[PDB]
Design a protein around this motif. Structure first.
Motif, PDB file in Angstrom:
ATOM      1  N   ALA A   5     -48.972  84.407  18.971  1.00  0.00           N
ATOM      2  CA  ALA A   5     -49.072  85.030  17.662  1.00  0.00           C
ATOM      3  C   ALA A   5     -47.793  85.758  17.327  1.00  0.00           C
ATOM      4  CB  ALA A   5     -50.201  86.016  17.674  1.00  0.00           C
ATOM      5  N   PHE A   6     -47.764  86.387  16.163  1.00  0.00           N
ATOM      6  CA  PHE A   6     -46.628  87.177  15.742  1.00  0.00           C
ATOM      7  C   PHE A   6     -47.098  88.541  15.286  1.00  0.00           C
ATOM      8  CE2 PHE A   6     -45.372  82.725  14.690  1.00  0.00           C
ATOM      9  CZ  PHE A   6     -44.419  82.577  15.679  1.00  0.00           C
ATOM     10  N   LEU A   7     -46.782  89.537  16.059  1.00  0.00           N
ATOM     11  CA  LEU A   7     -47.166  90.900  15.766  1.00  0.00           C
ATOM     12  C   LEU A   7     -45.940  91.773  15.852  1.00  0.00           C
ATOM     13  CD1 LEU A   7     -50.451  91.108  17.790  1.00  0.00           C
ATOM     14  CD2 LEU A   7     -50.290  90.893  15.335  1.00  0.00           C
ATOM     15  N   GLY A   8     -45.936  92.872  15.141  1.00  0.00           N
ATOM     16  CA  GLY A   8     -44.760  93.693  15.085  1.00  0.00           C
ATOM     17  C   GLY A   8     -44.721  94.695  16.187  1.00  0.00           C
ATOM     18  N   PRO A   9     -43.594  95.413  16.348  1.00  0.00           N
ATOM     19  CA  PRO A   9     -43.427  96.420  17.412  1.00  0.00           C
ATOM     20  C   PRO A   9     -44.435  97.561  17.283  1.00  0.00           C
ATOM     21  CG  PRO A   9     -41.649  96.570  15.799  1.00  0.00           C
ATOM     22  CD  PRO A   9     -42.377  95.291  15.522  1.00  0.00           C
ATOM     23  N   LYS A  10     -44.994  97.690  16.105  1.00  0.00           N
ATOM     24  CA  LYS A  10     -45.967  98.709  15.840  1.00  0.00           C
ATOM     25  C   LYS A  10     -47.380  98.191  16.092  1.00  0.00           C
ATOM     26  CE  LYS A  10     -42.953 100.886  12.403  1.00  0.00           C
ATOM     27  NZ  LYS A  10     -42.868 101.506  11.052  1.00  0.00           N
ATOM     28  N   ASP A  11     -47.531  96.873  16.095  1.00  0.00           N
ATOM     29  CA  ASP A  11     -48.828  96.237  16.339  1.00  0.00           C
ATOM     30  C   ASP A  11     -49.085  96.167  17.808  1.00  0.00           C
ATOM     31  OD1 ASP A  11     -50.018  95.001  13.745  1.00  0.00           O
ATOM     32  OD2 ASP A  11     -47.982  94.108  13.704  1.00  0.00           O
ATOM     33  N   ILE A  12     -48.017  96.255  18.553  1.00  0.00           N
ATOM     34  CA  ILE A  12     -48.053  96.132  19.972  1.00  0.00           C
ATOM     35  C   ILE A  12     -47.769  97.451  20.653  1.00  0.00           C
ATOM     36  CG2 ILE A  12     -47.460  93.705  19.944  1.00  0.00           C
ATOM     37  CD1 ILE A  12     -44.612  94.365  20.328  1.00  0.00           C
ATOM     38  N   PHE A  13     -48.314  97.591  21.809  1.00  0.00           N
ATOM     39  CA  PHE A  13     -48.166  98.773  22.605  1.00  0.00           C
ATOM     40  C   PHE A  13     -47.894  98.331  24.018  1.00  0.00           C
ATOM     41  CE2 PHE A  13     -49.573 102.160  19.686  1.00  0.00           C
ATOM     42  CZ  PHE A  13     -50.155 101.415  18.682  1.00  0.00           C
ATOM     43  N   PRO A  14     -46.972  98.963  24.713  1.00  0.00           N
ATOM     44  CA  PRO A  14     -46.569  98.537  26.067  1.00  0.00           C
ATOM     45  C   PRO A  14     -47.659  98.691  27.111  1.00  0.00           C
ATOM     46  CG  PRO A  14     -45.508 100.586  25.466  1.00  0.00           C
ATOM     47  CD  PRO A  14     -46.236 100.124  24.258  1.00  0.00           C
ATOM     48  N   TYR A  15     -47.911  97.602  27.811  1.00  0.00           N
ATOM     49  CA  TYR A  15     -48.981  97.491  28.790  1.00  0.00           C
ATOM     50  C   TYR A  15     -48.852  98.535  29.881  1.00  0.00           C
ATOM     51  CZ  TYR A  15     -51.925  95.496  32.474  1.00  0.00           C
ATOM     52  OH  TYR A  15     -52.865  95.326  33.466  1.00  0.00           O
ATOM     53  N   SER A  16     -47.651  98.887  30.203  1.00  0.00           N
ATOM     54  CA  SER A  16     -47.377  99.862  31.218  1.00  0.00           C
ATOM     55  C   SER A  16     -47.941 101.255  30.871  1.00  0.00           C
ATOM     56  CB  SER A  16     -45.882  99.895  31.402  1.00  0.00           C
ATOM     57  OG  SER A  16     -45.243  99.489  30.186  1.00  0.00           O
ATOM     58  N   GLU A  17     -47.533 101.797  29.733  1.00  0.00           N
ATOM     59  CA  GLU A  17     -47.952 103.127  29.321  1.00  0.00           C
ATOM     60  C   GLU A  17     -49.420 103.160  28.955  1.00  0.00           C
ATOM     61  OE1 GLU A  17     -44.890 101.633  28.805  1.00  0.00           O
ATOM     62  OE2 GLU A  17     -43.972 102.706  27.133  1.00  0.00           O
ATOM     63  N   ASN A  18     -49.893 102.092  28.393  1.00  0.00           N
ATOM     64  CA  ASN A  18     -51.272 102.066  27.922  1.00  0.00           C
ATOM     65  C   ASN A  18     -52.209 101.186  28.714  1.00  0.00           C
ATOM     66  OD1 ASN A  18     -50.649  99.832  25.593  1.00  0.00           O
ATOM     67  ND2 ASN A  18     -49.269 101.538  25.404  1.00  0.00           N
ATOM     68  N   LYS A  19     -51.845 100.945  29.964  1.00  0.00           N
ATOM     69  CA  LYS A  19     -52.720 100.255  30.939  1.00  0.00           C
ATOM     70  C   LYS A  19     -53.972 101.103  31.180  1.00  0.00           C
ATOM     71  CE  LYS A  19     -51.170  98.361  35.034  1.00  0.00           C
ATOM     72  NZ  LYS A  19     -52.022  97.203  35.385  1.00  0.00           N
ATOM     73  N   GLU A  20     -53.837 102.399  31.005  1.00  0.00           N
ATOM     74  CA  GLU A  20     -54.958 103.266  31.142  1.00  0.00           C
ATOM     75  C   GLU A  20     -55.849 103.207  29.922  1.00  0.00           C
ATOM     76  OE1 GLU A  20     -55.447 106.009  29.213  1.00  0.00           O
ATOM     77  OE2 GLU A  20     -53.520 106.782  28.625  1.00  0.00           O
ATOM     78  N   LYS A  21     -55.220 103.049  28.777  1.00  0.00           N
ATOM     79  CA  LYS A  21     -55.903 103.090  27.510  1.00  0.00           C
ATOM     80  C   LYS A  21     -56.639 101.801  27.248  1.00  0.00           C
ATOM     81  CE  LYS A  21     -55.445 106.185  25.536  1.00  0.00           C
ATOM     82  NZ  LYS A  21     -55.460 106.988  26.792  1.00  0.00           N
ATOM     83  N   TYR A  22     -55.888 100.732  27.214  1.00  0.00           N
ATOM     84  CA  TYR A  22     -56.406  99.462  26.757  1.00  0.00           C
ATOM     85  C   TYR A  22     -56.631  98.528  27.907  1.00  0.00           C
ATOM     86  CZ  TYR A  22     -54.561 101.693  22.627  1.00  0.00           C
ATOM     87  OH  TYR A  22     -54.279 102.604  21.649  1.00  0.00           O
ATOM     88  N   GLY A  23     -56.249  98.981  29.079  1.00  0.00           N
ATOM     89  CA  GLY A  23     -56.464  98.230  30.284  1.00  0.00           C
ATOM     90  C   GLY A  23     -57.900  98.393  30.754  1.00  0.00           C
ATOM     91  N   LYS A  24     -58.836  97.996  29.912  1.00  0.00           N
ATOM     92  CA  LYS A  24     -60.254  98.098  30.205  1.00  0.00           C
ATOM     93  C   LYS A  24     -60.974  96.799  29.897  1.00  0.00           C
ATOM     94  CE  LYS A  24     -59.974 102.102  31.874  1.00  0.00           C
ATOM     95  NZ  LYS A  24     -58.515 101.830  31.829  1.00  0.00           N
ATOM     96  N   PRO A  25     -61.844  96.353  30.831  1.00  0.00           N
ATOM     97  CA  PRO A  25     -62.639  95.133  30.689  1.00  0.00           C
ATOM     98  C   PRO A  25     -63.352  95.019  29.353  1.00  0.00           C
ATOM     99  CG  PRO A  25     -63.075  96.104  32.811  1.00  0.00           C
ATOM    100  CD  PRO A  25     -62.083  97.001  32.126  1.00  0.00           C
ATOM    101  N   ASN A  26     -63.207  93.894  28.764  1.00  0.00           N
ATOM    102  CA  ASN A  26     -63.707  93.684  27.466  1.00  0.00           C
ATOM    103  C   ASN A  26     -64.804  92.681  27.474  1.00  0.00           C
ATOM    104  OD1 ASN A  26     -63.361  93.327  24.306  1.00  0.00           O
ATOM    105  ND2 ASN A  26     -62.251  95.053  25.149  1.00  0.00           N
ATOM    106  N   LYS A  27     -65.303  92.397  26.309  1.00  0.00           N
ATOM    107  CA  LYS A  27     -66.384  91.487  26.126  1.00  0.00           C
ATOM    108  C   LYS A  27     -65.852  90.245  25.433  1.00  0.00           C
ATOM    109  CE  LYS A  27     -67.822  95.499  27.436  1.00  0.00           C
ATOM    110  NZ  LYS A  27     -66.813  96.552  27.789  1.00  0.00           N
ATOM    111  N   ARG A  28     -64.539  90.187  25.363  1.00  0.00           N
ATOM    112  CA  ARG A  28     -63.845  89.031  24.860  1.00  0.00           C
ATOM    113  C   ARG A  28     -63.423  88.167  26.041  1.00  0.00           C
ATOM    114  NH1 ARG A  28     -65.406  88.823  19.625  1.00  0.00           N
ATOM    115  NH2 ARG A  28     -64.066  89.969  18.124  1.00  0.00           N
TER     116      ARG A  28
END
Length: 93
Positions: free
Chosen positions: A51-74
């Motif tokens: 896909a194509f997302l902007g620098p603001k649409d994306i967040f670095p996996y490293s810093e936010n591995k705690e945030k978004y690094g959570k098991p999903n239902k997708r």
């Protein structure tokens, strides 16, 4: 975020209808004659989509591995959580 994003950098890609998904800033694909759209090529892990997302649409996996690094239902999300953390350079020929 408001930082730099390197081809190969590890991020979370947010799309409409989807949670912040583990993805990589990918490299310019063959056939893409399109200049920077303020969006970057984003390779989704676990689904292997792009896909194509902007620098603001994306967040670095490293810093936010705690945030978004959570098991999903997708599907592909959880599988991608593994790919991005173990083999983030995973793609086919």
């Amino acid at each position: 975020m408001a930082r730099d994003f390197k081809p190969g950098d590890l991020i979370f890609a947010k799309m409409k209808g989807y949670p912040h998904w583990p993805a990589r800033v990918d490299e310019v694909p063959d056939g893409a004659v399109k200049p920077p759209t303020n969006k970057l090529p984003i390779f989704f892990f676990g689904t292997h989509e792009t896909a194509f997302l902007g620098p603001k649409d994306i967040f670095p996996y490293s810093e936010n591995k705690e945030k978004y690094g959570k098991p999903n239902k997708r599907k592909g999300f959880n599988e991608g959580l593994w790919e991005i953390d173990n083999n983030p350079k995973v793609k086919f020929s």
